[PDB]
Design a protein around this ligand. Structure first.
Ligand code: XQB
Ligand code: SF4
Ligand code: CL
Ligand code: CL
Length: 302
């Protein structure tokens, strides 16, 4: 059944020379057939190291495109071409240009969860792990930041800089946990450590033991010996964490599912390898323009 699809996927990936890259929010069945599972930038950087020239990418479109931007001569395919990030998609070129006009001395800092077109208009890209450091290192004490207001506000708190968030009410619906869920797990597991994403709202961040990216979450049990961790992010990370640390318990803060990440299935992944579709193609000019603020990020962090 799934053994058939899994076996055929493994067979076709080897036969056709594909490396499979899966985001942390993919279903467990897809994480387990991937060569590498990680966050968007981790995956794009990993691809840069590969001898293979064909990639099957399992995530959402801005991430596949990030891989393509940094690996332009590889064929990058995705099983569901509609898999997208609604938060990214709410920020537009028009809004970025309006805000640059109003605040022409403010660098435009765009979270990696952003469309590739929007990236072409950014001064620097950031990830949830490096946003604070990126913004600290910028000359300016004021920045334009999008598309996530929560991450922006977190960055403001940590840097003491003024962060002008765009678009209005930009947020990830998946990470809108209730702070009351933390109150409830504290009572239920008094010794658990609560780790939440910086995309979570402030009251959730402030009640957590740790705030971090998924990449940061998976490093925490290397330094914290706690038996139980409660996890405030998308449900896919539970599988990732439990696989890496089988000796610990990982409890979801709440059940939170990214419908777009769940568009990828064993069946459409198999179809993708059978047909070698759908190729992620960006105009040359988009790749060249979007590369500029990505390199600026690498420079700042180096
Ligand atoms: N912040 C992320 C993460 O995986 O921690 C995002 C992905 C996700 O869509 C955010 O909620 C990324 O991979 O860059
Ligand atoms: S979890 Fe949130 S930020 Fe990530 S792809 Fe889904 S809607 Fe976008
Ligand atoms: Cl390349
Ligand atoms: Cl600068």
């Amino acid at each position: 059944h799934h053994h058939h699809m899994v076996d055929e996927i493994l067979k076709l990936k080897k036969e056709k020379g594909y490396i499979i890259l899966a985001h942390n929010f993919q279903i467990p069945e897809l994480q387990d057939i991937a060569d590498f599972v990680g966050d968007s930038l981790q995956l794009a950087r990993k691809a840069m190291e590969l001898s293979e020239k064909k990639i099957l990418f399992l995530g959402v479109d801005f991430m596949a495109e990030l891989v393509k931007i940094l690996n332009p001569d590889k064929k990058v395919i995705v099983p569901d071409r509609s898999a997208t990030c609604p938060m990214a998609n709410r920020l537009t070129p028009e809004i970025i240009r309006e805000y640059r006009e109003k605040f022409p001395d403010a660098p435009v800092v765009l979270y990696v969860n952003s469309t590739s077109e929007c990236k072409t208009l950014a001064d620097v890209i950031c990830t949830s792990a490096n946003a604070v450091e990126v913004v600290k290192k910028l000359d300016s004490s004021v920045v334009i930041f999008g598309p996530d207001r929560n991450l922006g506000e977190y960055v403001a708190e940590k840097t003491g800089k003024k962060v002008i968030t765009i678009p209005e009410n930009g947020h990830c619906p998946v990470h809108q946990f209730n702070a009351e869920s933390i109150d409830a797990v504290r009572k239920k597991y008094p010794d658990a450590k609560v780790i939440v994403h910086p995309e979570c709202p402030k009251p959730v961040r402030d009640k957590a033991d740790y705030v971090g990216s998924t990449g940061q979450m998976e490093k925490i049990p290397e330094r914290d010996p706690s038996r139980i961790f409660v996890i405030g992010t998308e449900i896919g990370m539970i599988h990732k964490l439990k696989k890496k640390f089988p000796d610990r318990e990982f409890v979801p803060l709440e059940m939170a599912v990214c419908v777009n990440m769940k568009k990828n299935t064993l069946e459409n992944t198999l179809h993708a390898l059978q047909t070698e579709s759908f190729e992620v193609i960006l105009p040359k000019e988009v790749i060249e323009k979007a590369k500029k603020p990505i390199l600026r990020m690498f420079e700042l962090m180096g």
